[PDB]
Structure to design on (1041 residues):
């Protein structure tokens, strides 16, 4: 809680699953703005 | 490994079964929603990173399958897999040992840990263990290249490592339990062995500068 | 009017007050150390307001660039052509010994996103495709949970910080490439292709990811930009020498008693850099044969030169080196300098996209000719040839990887040449 | 009108806005040494042989990807540019296998001709060389991938003109193998032109392989008849028989490419 | 890719019989005007050479290349097909 210059305070690093990146990606869908309308469905389109 | 021309293997073939979990399709949808529509070819990088979490490596059945779902030509994802280093196209062990021997690590004798791990495991650099559990190979530096010479297991790293406790890194890994990920030495975050030479006073809070309206 | 004592950086001088992950990396400790205080007001004042602040500051490119940040950002502040303006963060950190990118993300990831948010107001960035190296899966997660706290608090996202700004920052993990650390290579690394550097000139100013304006800024420059908007250009410019000012993560390592990453003032003498913050160099200065002060792309310099050279960009230039990323590492006398960079030069070969001919054929050829150098199977002329082709690839590669690989070997030749000529007849006498 | 004025080693030349140096010095009759740029094929700027230094410019500029502006008097024959051409070439030359007597490009090789004009006279390479596994992508073109210069001219021609993606460049580092990874075959109806595109003997005609040498062929001009396009062709004959059908230049009808059937 | 052969004109003739000789395979020929290509600066002097010795001509205009307007930035686009994904 204090400055405690002899601490790491990153135990959450140890508590990270193998799917962690994509798991936060899945739950990051609510507060999203609209990806810009490039027009063509694909760069090839 | 060390190959850039595909040989159709009996087990790693285009016919190799390879699919995604119901939550995994959500992860891909979460992957593609970050990048704009009509430019979904950018999503090829993290989905390929996602690809080897399922099988354990990059099967060639995955590369063309992920090409068809991402509506990209097969050769484009073919290049993404072969270029990046951790994108391994050959099956690898459960513990992908990533020993660091880049100059800053070798200066602090990163050879000692490599020899120590070589002696116990018997298998040489690159090849898998006889139980295919660990895979020792020399690569470039992890990107954290300041502590004592460091190693990286799949997605779980270790730095501030000595030839004595590299023995103590694989022992419990062989047993199954996970060792402590991070600096083995007294560096909780990065602090020098002589304590900490900065950040003595408590950090300040808000209300500083406030130039005009700020 | 002049702070000649530009060493022993003070605690307030440390922009990242949670640099060692002391209080809390996440939102809970972010407000404790001063994050998210009047960020909206910084955005509300105006894009030119922070443009003036960075101009009166003049942040040198800490990612081995040296370009003042005020002009680089101002090249982009204009009414949008139509292509969505984006912000790009380069957190590859493939440089040997460089750790500045990591000491920001895992110990105050909000500090980086402060610089993206306050910068993005100047840039006009409605989004930021911030990138993180593939070897930092642990640390992309830490800023992903941190990005959530700011996303749901209104600070970033929908009308970011309560002022009209649909600014959303997106994180992309890498998959391993030191060449990806360049802006022109990371830009199509994000775009979903082989991470090769882009030819010039187009610019990030007009094109970029999917052909969009993209401000690539080093995390250290990004995350220091808060303090220069919260205090002003007087704070940044007061520390450090002319042009070279502010504070940078000096990553002391190599043959040092206590190798660590410390925020440190620049224009600092090398001796007290390793003495105060690390207890000295192993074996003292006499054992110290040379130092790589700036990083890989910064040539090493001899003991007769180190003494108290100041790590300000101008002073490294006269020292025939650069600031790089202040990833300072030391080799003792026991360490063979020919062997010391032997892994360094082959590291460059292992990390090269290989598109342009000078780099693809250069470092590997340099690797083989130096392999017989460290072994000694060469003639005295061979060092001169190594000189010639090193300058040959200099300024002839599409990107700065070749030039970044040129400086280490280039510096060694003109600095420890007699030692290079020493090892070869040592080979000749016994392998005769 | 909007056109801007530059010079090329003296003489003033009028140029279009956005003009590159390659299409700037050709107006006076200069071919900057190139190995990765084709006129009707997208810019690459990878071979680095187009490099030319101008006065008042400390660093040499990639000519094929350099938008010229006012007051750019390109110093074509400047010594630094001459040094740049020499070093870049010998860097291509380094890992090239010594197959000139056994490569069909001998006598019509871009690497050979350039190395005789903008080239040195002896090698400083004292190390081992590099070798690549040969591929096989159809019984109509021979792929000696060891002789490749990684100009990426093949991958662009396939992706932009042929409309296929069976070609790519795999690897990281010096290796940078160019091929298909998984074995495949060039199914393009315009696949034959990739033989003409490759500047080296990496891609060569299988039927013609070791049947004649360029300096004995009495070229003649005719047209395609397989297609109604009437593609302009160059018929290479020797001592009273036809060896190869080469595509002529006509731009608006066939450019410089012909169908695989007529090749 | 070199061009330094398209800069001049010639006086090429048409082909005649190329028959295989009875022996090892010489392509014996009976027309002397076979390997007599000329080299000319322009085309008006080319024809001027043609009728002085009374040879029927068949001229052809030089195929000067069409303009080669290219843009490196065009390879990296937003909604333009010229967005290139291969280098
Ligand atoms: C080989 C190479 C690697 C680089 N790696 C990094 C890196 O890891 N992080 C970074 O911030 N900049 C890196 N850079 C610098 C970038 O290319 C770019 O100049 C910089 O990020 C721009 O922002 P800055 O001016 O704030 O440094 C690298 C450059 C080169 C040539
Ligand atoms: S120097 Fe050239 S070949 Fe090497 S990584 Fe950079 S762009 Fe690629
Ligand atoms: S491609 Fe050219 S240089 Fe290479 S072997 Fe053939 S003729 Fe010789
Ligand atoms: S195979 Fe030929 S066209 Fe393709 S990259 Fe190599 S030299 Fe260029
Ligand atoms: S043509 Fe300019 S680099 Fe290949
Ligand atoms: K060819």
């Amino acid at each position: 809680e204090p400055f405690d210059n002899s601490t790491y305070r990153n135990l959450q690093h140890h508590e990270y699953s193998t799917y962690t990146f994509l798991d936060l990606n899945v739950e990051l869908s609510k507060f999203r703005m609209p990806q810009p309308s490039s027009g063509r469905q694909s760069p090839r389109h | 490994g060390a190959l850039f021309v595909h040989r159709d293997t009996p087990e790693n073939n285009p016919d190799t079964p390879f699919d995604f979990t119901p939550e995994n399709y959500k992860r891909i949808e979460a992957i593609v929603k970050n990048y704009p529509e009509g430019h979904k070819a950018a999503a090829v990088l993290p989905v390929l990173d996602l690809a080897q979490r399922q099988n354990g490596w990059l099967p060639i059945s995955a590369m063309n399958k992920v090409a068809e779902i991402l509506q990209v030509p097969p050769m484009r994802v073919y290049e993404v897999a072969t270029f990046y280093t951790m994108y391994n196209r050959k099956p690898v062990g459960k513990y992908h040992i990533q020993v660091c021997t880049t100059t800053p690590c070798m200066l602090r004798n990163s050879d000692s840990i490599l020899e120590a791990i070589q002696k116990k495991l018997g298998i040489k650099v690159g090849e898998t263990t006889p139980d295919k559990l660990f895979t020792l190979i020399e690569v470039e530096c992890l990107g954290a290249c300041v502590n004592a010479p460091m190693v990286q297991i799949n997605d779980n790293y270790y730095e501030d490592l000595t030839p004595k406790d590299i023995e103590e890194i694989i022992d419990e890994l062989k047993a199954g339990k996970i060792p402590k990920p991070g600096p083995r030495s007294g560096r909780f975050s990065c602090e020098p062995a002589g304590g900490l030479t900065s950040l003595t006073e408590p950090p300040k809070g808000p209300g500083f500068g406030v130039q005009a309206g700020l | 009017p002049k702070k000649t004592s530009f060493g022993s950086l003070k605690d307030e001088d440390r922009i990242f007050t949670n640099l060692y992950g002391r209080h809390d990396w996440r939102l809970k400790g972010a407000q404790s150390r001063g994050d998210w205080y009047k960020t909206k007001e910084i955005l509300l004042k105006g894009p030119d307001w922070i443009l003036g602040e960075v101009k009166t500051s003049g942040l040198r490119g800490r990612g081995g660039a040296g370009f003042p940040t005020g002009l680089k950002w101002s090249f982009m502040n204009k009414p949008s052509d139509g292509r969505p303006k984006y912000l790009v963060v380069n957190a590859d950190e493939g440089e040997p010994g460089t750790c500045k990118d990591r000491e920001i993300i895992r110990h105050d990831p909000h500090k980086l996103v402060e610089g993206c948010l306050v910068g993005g107001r100047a840039m006009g960035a409605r989004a930021a495709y911030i990138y993180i190296r593939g070897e930092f899966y642990n640390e992309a997660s830490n800023l992903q949970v941190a990005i959530r706290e700011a996303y749901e608090a209104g600070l970033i996202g929908k009308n970011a910080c309560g002022s009209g700004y649909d600014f959303d920052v997106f994180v992309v993990r890498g998959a391993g490439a030191y060449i990806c650390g360049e802006e022109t290579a990371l830009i199509e690394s994000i775009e979903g292709k082989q991470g090769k550097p882009r030819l010039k000139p187009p610019f990030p100013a007009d094109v970029g990811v999917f052909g969009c304006p993209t401000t690539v800024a080093n995390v250290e420059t990004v995350a220091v930009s808060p303090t220069i908007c919260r205090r002003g250009g007087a704070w940044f410019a007061s520390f450090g020498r002319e042009r070279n000012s502010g504070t940078k993560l000096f990553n002391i390592s190599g043959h040092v008693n206590h190798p660590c990453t410390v925020e440190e003032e620049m224009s600092v003498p090398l001796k007290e850099l390793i003495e105060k913050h690390a207890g000295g160099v192993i074996g003292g200065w006499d054992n110290l044969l040379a130092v790589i002060p700036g990083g890989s792309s910064t040539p090493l310099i001899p003991k007769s030169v180190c003494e108290t050279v100041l790590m300000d960009f101008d002073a490294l230039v006269q020292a025939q080196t650069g600031l790089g990323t202040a990833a300072v590492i030391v080799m003792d006398r026991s360490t063979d300098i020919v062997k010391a960079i032997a892994r360094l030069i082959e590291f460059y070969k292992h990390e090269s996209c290989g598109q342009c001919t000078p780099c693809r054929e250069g470092v590997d050829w340099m690797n083989k000719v130096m392999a017989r150098f460290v072994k000694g199977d060469a003639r005295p002329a061979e060092i001169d040839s190594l000189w010639e082709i090193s300058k040959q690839i200099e300024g002839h590669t599409i990107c700065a990887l070749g030039d970044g690989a040129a400086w280490p070997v280039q510096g060694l030749i003109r600095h420890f040449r007699p030692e290079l000529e020493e090892r070869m007849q040592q080979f000749a006498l016994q392998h005769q | 009108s909007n056109l801007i004025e530059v010079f090329v080693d003296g003489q003033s030349v009028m140029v279009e806005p956005g003009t590159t140096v390659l299409q700037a010095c050709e107006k006076v009759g200069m071919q900057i040494p190139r190995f990765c740029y084709h006129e009707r094929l997208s810019v690459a700027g990878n071979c680095r042989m187009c490099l030319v230094e101008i006065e008042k410019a400390p660093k040499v500029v990639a000519a094929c990807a350099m938008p010229v502006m006012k007051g750019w008097n390109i110093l074509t024959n400047s010594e630094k540019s001459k040094k740049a051409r020499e070093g870049v070439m010998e860097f291509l030359l380094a890992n090239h296998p010594l197959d000139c007597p056994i490569c069909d490009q001998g006598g019509e090789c871009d690497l050979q001709d350039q190395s005789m004009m903008f080239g040195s006279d002896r090698s400083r390479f004292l190390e081992g060389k590099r070798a690549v596994e040969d591929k096989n992508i159809g019984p109509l073109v021979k792929t000696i991938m060891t002789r490749c210069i990684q100009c990426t001219r093949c991958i662009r021609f396939a992706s932009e003109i042929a409309g296929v993606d069976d070609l790519g460049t795999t690897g990281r580092g010096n290796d940078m193998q160019v091929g298909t990874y998984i074995e495949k075959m060039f199914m393009s109806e315009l696949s034959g032109n990739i033989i003409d595109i490759c500047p080296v003997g990496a891609l060569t005609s299988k039927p013609y392989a070791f049947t004649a040498r360029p300096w004995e062929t009495r070229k003649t001009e005719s047209i395609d008849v397989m297609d109604a396009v009437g593609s302009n062709i160059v018929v290479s004959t020797r001592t009273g028989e036809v060896m190869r059908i080469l595509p002529r230049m006509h731009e608006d009808i066939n450019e410089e490419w012909i169908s695989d059937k007529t090749r | 890719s070199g061009v330094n052969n398209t800069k001049k004109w010639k006086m090429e003739f048409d082909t005649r019989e190329r028959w295989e000789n009875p022996l090892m395979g010489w392509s014996s020929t009976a027309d002397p005007l076979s390997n007599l290509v000329l080299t000319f600066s322009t085309k008006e002097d080319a024809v001027a050479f043609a009728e002085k010795n009374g040879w029927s001509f068949d001229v052809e205009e030089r195929k000067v290349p069409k303009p080669k307007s290219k843009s490196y930035g065009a390879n990296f686009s937003w909604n333009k097909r010229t967005r290139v994904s291969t280098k």
The pocket of FE2/S2 (inorganic) cluster (ligand 5) is lined by residues D 34-37, 44-50, 62-64 (CB under 6 Å). Chain A touches chain B at residues 2-3, 5-8, 10, 13-14, 18-19, 21-23, 25-26, 28-29, 32, 35-43, 45 (CB under 8 Å). The radius of gyration of chain A is 19 Å. Helices of chain A lie at 11-14, 20-26.
